[PDB]
Design an enzyme around this catalytic site. Structure first.
Site, PDB file in Angstrom:
ATOM      1  CG  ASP A   1      57.666   6.577  53.460  1.00 42.89           C
ATOM      2  OD1 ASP A   1      58.237   5.615  52.906  1.00 42.89           O
ATOM      3  OD2 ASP A   1      58.272   7.600  53.844  1.00 42.89           O
TER       4      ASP A   1
ATOM      5  CB  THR B   1      54.083   4.910  59.246  1.00 42.98           C
ATOM      6  OG1 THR B   1      54.440   4.738  57.869  1.00 42.98           O
ATOM      7  CG2 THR B   1      54.947   6.006  59.859  1.00 42.98           C
ATOM      8  CB  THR B   2      53.783   0.204  56.523  1.00 42.06           C
ATOM      9  OG1 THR B   2      53.963   1.286  55.600  1.00 42.06           O
ATOM     10  CG2 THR B   2      52.959  -0.893  55.861  1.00 42.06           C
TER      11      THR B   2
ATOM     12  CG  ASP C   1      61.152   7.225  56.026  1.00 41.13           C
ATOM     13  OD1 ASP C   1      60.719   8.240  56.609  1.00 41.13           O
ATOM     14  OD2 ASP C   1      60.566   6.695  55.058  1.00 41.13           O
TER      15      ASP C   1
END
Ligand SMILES: Nc1ncnc2c1ncn2[C@@H]1O[C@H](COP(=O)(O)OP(=O)(O)O)[C@@H](O)[C@H]1O
Ligand SMILES: [Mg+2]
Ligand SMILES: [Mg+2]
Lengths: 80, 192, 50, 48, 191, 518
Positions: F57, F90-91, F384
């Protein structure tokens, strides 16, 4: 006195170790059976070493060895 | 259960340790330890029932399976009344043997000199009637927990138990209560 | 009883424990009612107000 | 297989060298999972 | 040099009377009046003596105002205890507070539940010991593994009070300095 | 002059800018390898206590790494809040935010356009992108079978990048079955992650009921059939009485022995109050002393102690009953029922397994693996997945994945690029190239040619069709509806909105003021 010594005094002289004075009843008293027996007790002093010589235990015999030498550090080898 | 396969498998599986050459008597010891717990569902046998007590002294050849539950701690020897017991009834005490008080702090006042005679007599009386109930139940061996917060025993309580020829011990781990109760078959006790 | 000296109150009954805990509310409200009767619209003080 | 006492090859069942299958199963299984995790690493970054 | 100072420094008002026949009166009584005045100050400062089981509204006063004291910077140390009855160390620390309260009457000993102290406090971090002084936190102590943990004793707690400046090193009430009467009896015989 | 003082770094309009862009390049190149299904995991070594952390993550990578650059701290915070909102993607925010600034670096240098003019192009470009993203979505939840299938596809798309990419066919059933058991309740606290060493990754099995890591008492039995469960936030400990300030004045110790008798009789009457219901187990929040423990033996009641705060709600919802402390009125507070209360062992730690409960509103994901670093990756991976699928229950709209969402959004942006006069139209096209750079990176991590697949995908979607996407297994264009790749609408909406705000903050900078550190 120390704990480990008095067990051997009571074992030799025939007494019993008394941690406290009591019985199964509610009253508080002391019985003559708790006392030991020996023939002679003499306090002796030799070079700033007072020692109470208890001899003649009736119930069971006992023994002690009085080592004598130059100093305490030489007697530690004799003690070992 | 097959002694031909399990004993030979246990001996040839260690194979690298110091007790590998001592495995002539320890491999049956491992097989006999697990065979007492048996089930058809192929359960994951818990090793908490198999306690390994470490005592420094002697040699490895003296190792042997003890029939009963071996205790690690030593005796108190404050009074030292009894020496060797035979046909003894074992009990597991979880409470504390002390003069009467709650777990919290208290205040005791003395308004007259005669009150001290009742206090000193009644404090040992609370220890006395516990020993009477122990004598009525003929419980010869007692096991007292650690109890850091409240005093486990004292010279007064040891003296009454010294006359009845009852041994006592301290410093028992809280996790080992399952092993002692299930092993010796003695239920714990937390109330007189 | 913020800056007041520590009053060592000792009681020996359960029924009086309800009276002694309500006496604190009784005293502080008696002081408020006496100020209320005069109609003081702006109350001031050098020391803190509860 | 191999027998260490005679220092040669022989039948291990006669010489009684046996082991469970779960030991060798977990060895091959856990070894493959460890290589799966190591080969996916690309960078070594310092952190708090 | 220290041999002259040990006559007065190493003797309380009860022990200074030993030198009444040996030492001069004016040399001895001049210091006894000094030590007598110090004893009177401790009696006036003895505003405490039992654990103050408080509640939060009050914390904003008892814990902090007290820490100011007279505000002559008459500071007052206030040992707080965020108690948690489920933990074993908390009940041990509660016993140490009442024992120390009977001895050190000048130091305030405060206790309160940890669940009522801070919103959603971690139960694992309890028991907690805070030390206030003049409104400032002198020490935010964590669970008693530093002080032996489950085997904590009264001697270890009194030693901690000396480190934070709450009690002097040579105080006669500390168990480290308060030698038994049988100990001093053997010293005089073997002297 | 020197007003700022000694040891204060200041920058002005050529050192201020190009220090944030190179910081945006520095923070973006790290998370470039982690994007996509064929991405490599990054290992983080701590400076103290030799603590290692394997994690994919992007938020967790930026949590641990220290970054003194102020521009990189913006990317650190936006990945934190993105993990707080959705948990996944998030990436993509960090990559899209860095590439938007990479393009804007060229528009400022090459084309010589003001920064405020670039933002005005991004406002119209972002509005056209979100309008295309809203129209490209599709309704769901009218048929429970289709809603079941779409959650399976979302779980497969989420776990394709994590360590569960090979076993996602099995973990998709485990992920989607737990969410439907919630009965609409959106909360992650009702799902436990029990760490077990041993086994392999595909050994994770679906549990019926609820399982936790607790233990019975000293004397309690192993099995009880049809046990009634109760939960006490009570104090079966030394209760005290609560009017703290009670002490015991004692004139003689005769009544003190009877006072201690009353304390034992007080707690005896409290345990006698428990037996009026006739329960078979007793669950307490905190530690149970031995004297209450002995009283449950003769009454035939099990005992479980030291339950966490989360474990109370996690066990009560499965039981169906409510937490009771007073024990006064037996009329209300109807308790549940459980068939099998027998514990099992998974590894070296026994766990209390329940089965046959009234409701399953709380669940527990049993995991098996080799290294704790893999279990930590297993925890973050399914966290996630469960976070995305849990928010998919409340937000029904979804959008096709596989890089088609990025290109279909850029189609309307390129369409609206021509009718906008001025120099901001180039910035509108710069926003389009930023959306195109995401599938360009998906082909780089897979090791295939990026220019061909992006050119084939871009030319294919402008023809009229809007279901094509990238197939990285075969390395060609394929139908996303066949493969079953779909993601939530709020995920890509949050990514484009967060990335638009990310470029907006760093593009409105002209000076840097770095005060002295403490
Ligand atoms: N099986 C797949 N086939 C093709 N593309 C995929 C697949 N799984 C994921 N992707 C692509 O990867 C991109 C990012 O995936 P995501 O799960 O957000 O990774 P991360 O969580 O690391 O940001 C998505 O835009 C999606 O299009
Ligand atoms: Mg081996
Ligand atoms: Mg993802």
């Amino acid at each position: 006195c120390k704990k480990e010594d008095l067990r051997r005094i009571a074992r030799a002289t025939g007494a019993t170790l008394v941690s406290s004075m009591s019985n199964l009843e509610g009253e508080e008293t002391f019985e003559s059976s708790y006392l030991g027996l020996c023939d002679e007790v003499v306090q002796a002093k030799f070079s700033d070493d007072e020692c109470i010589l208890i001899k003649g235990t009736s119930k069971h015999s006992s023994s002690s060895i009085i080592l004598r030498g130059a100093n305490d550090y030489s007697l530690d080898e004799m003690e070992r | 259960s097959d002694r031909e396969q399990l004993v030979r498998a246990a001996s040839t599986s260690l194979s690298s340790k110091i007790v590998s050459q001592y495995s002539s008597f320890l491999a049956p010891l491992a097989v006999d330890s697990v065979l007492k717990i048996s089930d058809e569902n192929s359960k994951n046998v818990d090793l908490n029932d198999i306690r390994l007590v470490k005592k420094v002294g002697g040699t490895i050849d003296d190792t042997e399976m003890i029939d009963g539950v071996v205790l690690t701690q030593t005796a108190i020897k404050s009074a030292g009344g009894p020496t060797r017991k035979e046909k003894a009834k074992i009990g597991l005490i979880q409470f504390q043997i002390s003069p009467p008080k709650p777990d919290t702090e208290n205040n005791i006042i003395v308004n007259d000199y005669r009150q001290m005679d009742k206090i000193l007599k009644e404090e040992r009386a609370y220890l006395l009637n516990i020993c009477k109930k122990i004598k009525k139940a003929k419980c010869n061996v007692l096991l007292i927990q650690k109890s850091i917060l409240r005093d486990a025993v004292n010279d007064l309580a040891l003296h009454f138990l010294s006359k009845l020829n009852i041994m006592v011990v301290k410093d028992i781990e809280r996790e080992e209560i399952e092993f002692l109760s299930k092993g010796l078959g003695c239920k714990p006790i937390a109330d007189i | 009883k913020a800056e007041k000296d520590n009053a060592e109150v000792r009681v020996e009954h359960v029924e009086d424990y309800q009276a002694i805990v309500d006496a604190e509310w009784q005293l502080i409200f008696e002081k408020l009612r006496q100020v209320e009767e005069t109609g003081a619209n702006i109350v001031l003080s050098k020391l803190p107000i509860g | 297989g191999i027998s260490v006492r005679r220092s040669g090859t022989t039948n291990t069942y006669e010489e009684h060298i046996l082991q469970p299958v779960l030991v060798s199963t977990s060895a091959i299984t856990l070894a493959s999972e460890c290589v799966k995790s190591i080969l996916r690493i690309d960078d070594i970054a310092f952190s708090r | 040099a220290k041999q002259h100072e040990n006559r007065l420094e190493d003797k309380d008002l009860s022990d200074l009377e030993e030198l009444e026949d040996d030492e001069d009166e004016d040399f001895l009584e001049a210091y006894k009046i000094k030590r007598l005045n110090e004893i009177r100050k401790l009696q006036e400062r003895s505003k405490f003596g039992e654990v103050f089981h408080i509640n939060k509204p009050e914390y904003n006063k008892e814990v902090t105002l007290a820490s100011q004291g007279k505000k002559d910077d008459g500071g007052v140390y206030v040992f707080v205890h965020l108690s948690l009855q489920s933990k074993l160390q908390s009940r041990i620390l509660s016993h140490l507070f009442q024992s120390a309260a009977c001895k050190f009457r000048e130091i305030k000993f405060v206790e309160i539940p940890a669940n009522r102290a801070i919103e959603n406090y971690p139960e694992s971090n309890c028991p907690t010991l805070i030390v206030y002084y003049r409104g400032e936190v002198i020490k935010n102590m964590i669970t008693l593994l530093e002080l032996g943990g489950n085997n904590s004793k009264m001697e270890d707690f009194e030693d901690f009070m000396v480190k934070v400046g709450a009690v002097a090193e040579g105080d006669n009430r500390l168990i480290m300095n308060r030698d038994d009467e049988e100990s001093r009896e053997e010293r005089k015989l073997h002297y | 002059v020197q007003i700022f003082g000694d040891q204060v770094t200041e920058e002005r309009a050529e050192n201020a800018r190009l220090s944030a862009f190179v910081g945006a390049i520095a923070v973006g190149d790290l998370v470039k390898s982690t994007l996509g299904p064929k991405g490599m995991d990054k290992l983080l070594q701590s400076a103290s206590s030799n603590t290692c952390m394997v994690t994919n993550d992007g938020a967790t990578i930026l949590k641990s790494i220290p970054l003194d650059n102020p521009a990189a701290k913006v990317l650190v915070n936006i990945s934190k809040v993105q993990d707080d909102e959705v948990g996944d993607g998030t990436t993509s925010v960090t990559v899209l935010s860095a590439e938007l600034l990479r393009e804007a670096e060229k528009l400022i240098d090459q084309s010589k356009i003001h920064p405020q003019t670039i933002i005005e192009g991004y406002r119209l470009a972002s509005a056209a992108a979100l309008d295309a993203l809203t129209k490209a979505a599709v309704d769901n939840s009218h048929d429970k079978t289709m809603f079941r299938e779409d959650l399976i596809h979302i779980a497969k798309t989420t776990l394709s990048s994590k360590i569960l990419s090979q076993d996602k066919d099995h973990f998709a059933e485990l992920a989607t079955n737990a969410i439907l058991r919630l009965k609409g309740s959106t909360n992650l606290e009702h799902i436990q992650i029990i760490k077990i060493l041993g086994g392999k990754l595909s050994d994770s099995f679906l549990d019926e009921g609820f399982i936790l890591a607790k233990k019975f008492g000293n004397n309690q039995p192993k099995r009880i059939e049809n046990a009634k469960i109760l939960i006490a936030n009570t104090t079966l400990d030394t209760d005290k009485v609560k009017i703290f300030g009670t002490k015991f004045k004692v004139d003689s110790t005769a009544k003190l022995a009877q006072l201690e008798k009353a304390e034992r009789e007080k707690m005896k009457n409290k345990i006698a109050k428990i037996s009026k219901f006739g329960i078979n187990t007793f669950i307490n929040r905190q530690l149970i002393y031995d004297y209450p423990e002995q009283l449950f033996t003769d009454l035939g009641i099990n005992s479980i102690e030291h339950a966490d705060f989360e474990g109370v709600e996690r066990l009560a919802l499965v039981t169906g009953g409510e937490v009771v402390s007073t024990f006064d009125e037996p009329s209300k507070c109807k308790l549940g029922e459980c068939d099998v209360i027998e514990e099992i062992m998974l590894g070296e730690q026994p766990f209390l397994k329940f089965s046959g409960c009234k409701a399953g509103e709380a669940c527990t994901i049993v995991l098996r693996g080799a290294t704790d670093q893999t279990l930590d990756e297993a925890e973050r991976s399914l966290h996630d997945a469960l976070s995305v699928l849990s928010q998919t229950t409340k937000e029904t709209r979804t959008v096709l994945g596989g890089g088609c969402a990025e290109m279909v959004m850029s189609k309307a942006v390129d369409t609206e690029a021509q009718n906008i006069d001025g120099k901001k139209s180039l910035a509108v096209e710069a926003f389009a190239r930023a959306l195109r750079q995401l599938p360009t990176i998906l082909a780089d991590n897979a090791g295939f040619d990026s220019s061909e697949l992006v050119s084939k995908l871009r030319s294919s979607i402008y023809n009229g069709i809007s279901t094509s996407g990238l197939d990285l297994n075969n390395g060609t264009i394929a139908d996303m509806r066949q493969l079953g790749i779909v993601e939530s609408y709020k995920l890509k909406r949050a990514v484009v909105s967060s990335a638009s705000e990310a470029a907006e903050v760093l593009l409105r900078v002209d000076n840097i003021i770095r005060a002295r550190p403490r």
